[PDB]
């Protein structure tokens, strides 16, 4: 039940390192992913590592929404919801223009681009937030 | 004075794992937060993990600033300053338009949106940088 | 003695799988690599990759003579920095209200997804993050 300086080993218990720790190989942490059909044609692909850092990738295209409106689709599942509202910037493919969405702590998503009419505009980009 | 394969333990010393490490529970690293009234109505909420990765959340509303001007507010505290100038993109709420700011290693912030006249414009978004961006 | 101690600087081989919770009060240092890319059309990327997974890209340079959906006509991203899946990274034009994005593709090519840019260079800046895995 001792940890050695060689060999593959499994280690249980809470280990608190008070100093500097270096890893020269790979550090593997939990990863979870989620796809959200957020509404109005917007899709989010979320990847969460260490139950904290989330990178959101925008897909789809948005139409028929105004600033301040919540997207009319599926809310972000509980394990991806941030503790505070997170504003994620995205870009309209092939344009000079951008938008942001807010992912609210309840999982709802609020649109904060300009109003978009019936003509969809492709939405892309990566945004990052911390859950805690 | 020995680390075991069970139990809660505290481990002092620089420990270098030359191979692979996996953590199946939570990995807790240092976290520090700071709110900065940057100037010109712009507010930054910074969260720094592992004295390295920072996510900056923009709040407030900017007015009366020209491109390339330092913002006329509070400088970023030393622990949050990057080693190289970092450009963080933000978005004006309810608009098609965006800006960026440069967070300078000295703690200052430079505005790099368009010139903004006296009417404030709400500023939002998350941007991330490494303090230790270099190998 | 081949055991890890609760004191002292020590180097430790073997894959160590911590099935529980781990806390680091000092700094955790993971592998870091950097790359500068003249991506084409004046666009420059400075990339930092940590743990062979998280990448922050920093845009520099000034872009000209590029159309939407065209691949940029410069150096492709070196293999170690390529994402598994296409990653769209938003950038900002310095001193302007306008923005762009590029797609960093799995082969290291980069596709321009701003508006078309004619002969006059516009300065490009900003950070974007992605996971390789």
From Swiss-Prot, chain C:
Annotated region (Host receptor binding), positions in chain: 33-133
Subcellular location, record wording: Virion
Source taxon at top rank: Viruses
Stretches assigned to coiled coil: none
Function: Binds to the host phosphopolysaccharides at the onset of infection. Upon activation by calcium, the receptor binding proteins change their conformation, presenting their binding sites to the host, and a channel opens at the bottom of the baseplate for DNA ejection.
Record's subunit section: Homotrimer; found as an assembly of 6 homotrimers. Interacts with host phosphopolysaccharides; this allows the virus to bind the external cell wall layer. Interacts with the distal tail protein.
Entry remark concerning the domains of this protein: The C-terminus is involved in host receptor binding. Host-recognition domains point upwards, towards the capsid.
Family: Belongs to the skunalikevirus receptor binding protein family.
Protein name as it appears in the record: Receptor binding protein
Organism expressing this protein natively: Lactococcus phage p2
First and last residues shown, out of full length: 163 to 264 of 264
